[PDB]
Amino acid sequence: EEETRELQSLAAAVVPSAQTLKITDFSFSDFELSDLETALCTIRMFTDLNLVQNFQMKHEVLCRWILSVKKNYRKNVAYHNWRHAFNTAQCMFAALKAGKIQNKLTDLEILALLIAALSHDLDHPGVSNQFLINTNSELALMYNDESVLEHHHFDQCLMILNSPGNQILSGLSIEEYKTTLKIIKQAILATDLALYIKRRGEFFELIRKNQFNLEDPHQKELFLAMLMTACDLSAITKPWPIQQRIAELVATEFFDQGDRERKELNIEPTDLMNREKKNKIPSMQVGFIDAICLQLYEALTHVSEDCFPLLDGCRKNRQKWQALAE
């Protein structure tokens, strides 16, 4: 069997060190890596966060789970594919390690964040929540138009975690498992950008008034939400060649949706979804950095000064895009 062969080869392979895989670097790139290499990188992330040892994960089970996750991202979507999910998880790993965020959270929270990052866009169809709503998608009906995609992504995450041979959370007690799934669900739902915009104000105000308290459960959940967003948008902080390449992937998906909107729904798409504005991608990226990213990475920097490289990377990309916009 082909799938059996893939798993037996992965499970028997040595897992290279974090150093060799460069996964502790905020400026990490997956572009020269094969699919197998990304899976090995993923095993190393779980291992170096002590999740394998601390939660008694069988090596074969972890390997099968990673392959299942990778297989459940679509191969015909330009941006919302396995590489995006993988890069999101690596940014989380780098934030927890080099960003020194791991000392502020428990092992169970770290377990949930890593799983959530890897699973956060599972089976993404390559269209937005609003498009699914306006086209009467079965997903929109099921989730009452609320964070439609994100609910779908969590459902897929749950489906995989429960499938035979993929149960990486079998070592958790029933109480721990209930708790972990709740954190994972909230973390995936947090990647809905509409929710980030809605709640970012409370987070920023807590930092401004020196009242940020991670012992408060509401604020802990809030922080996990902002971290998920920070990881999800982290391509905007990457070295220029990586950000230029990724931005074109994002535009590819957006423009394709816009073409469907114009033809099937008879509506003029917004600028970000309108192919006529391809020449304005630089101004649109600067606009996205100013409205969303800058303040998020500034806030994360106040939380942990070792997260400064994310803010620095974001600022450098704004300079690069603004030069092309002028």
Ligand SMILES: Nc1nc2c(ncn2[C@@H]2O[C@H](COP(=O)(O)O)[C@@H](O)[C@H]2O)c(=O)[nH]1
């Ligand atoms: N304009 C713009 N939006 C982005 C970019 N990267 C992430 N996003 C925004 O943040 C959201 C992240 O959610 P995701 O697309 O991963 O499901 C995107 O849908 C999009 O609205 C970008 O490079 N440019």
Ligand SMILES: [Mg+2]
């Ligand atoms: Mg998403």
Ligand SMILES: [Zn+2]
């Ligand atoms: Zn995403």
